[PDB]
């Protein structure tokens, strides 16, 4: 997990742009906070682009999102 390797080491983590600063004056490659310009191109969880998971307690295998659409792709079949 060497972020400033072949550098002067780690100076501190900037909180604005969320990047480490090495001891030489370069913005390092690593992140240093969760609020960063950081690309995400893949997601998990069901009911995506919908109302999310409805909080009901269904004994049946169907789970229906909060927009009312049923996610059979996550709902287990008979």
């Amino acid at each position: 997990d060497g972020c400033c390797s072949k550098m002067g080491g780690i100076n501190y983590c900037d909180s604005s742009a969320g990047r480490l600063v090495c001891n030489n004056g370069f913005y390092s490659t690593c992140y240093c906070t969760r609020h960063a310009v950081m690309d995400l191109q893949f997601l998990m969880g069901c009911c995506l682009w919908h109302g999310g998971v409805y909080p009901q307690l269904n004994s049946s295998g169907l789970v229906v999102c909060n927009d009312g659409y049923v996610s059979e792709e996550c709902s287990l079949q008979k």
Binding site: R34, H35, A36, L40
Partner: protein
């Protein structure tokens, strides 16, 4: 005034303008009585108040 109240507050056409909470969330004040949320991957802050 009689024993019965009366008013005509219909205003059938005019939509509501905007919520006042937009200004507080613009300045960064969290809306009162709400709770925070978790945002990760960008540069943003968020809240949830009245399931909105």
């Amino acid at each position: 005034y009689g024993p019965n109240a009366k008013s005509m507050p219909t205003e059938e056409g005019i939509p509501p303008s905007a919520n006042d909470l937009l200004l507080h969330v613009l300045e960064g004040v969290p809306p009162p009585g709400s709770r925070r949320l978790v945002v990760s991957g960008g540069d943003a802050r968020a809240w949830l108040s009245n399931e909105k």
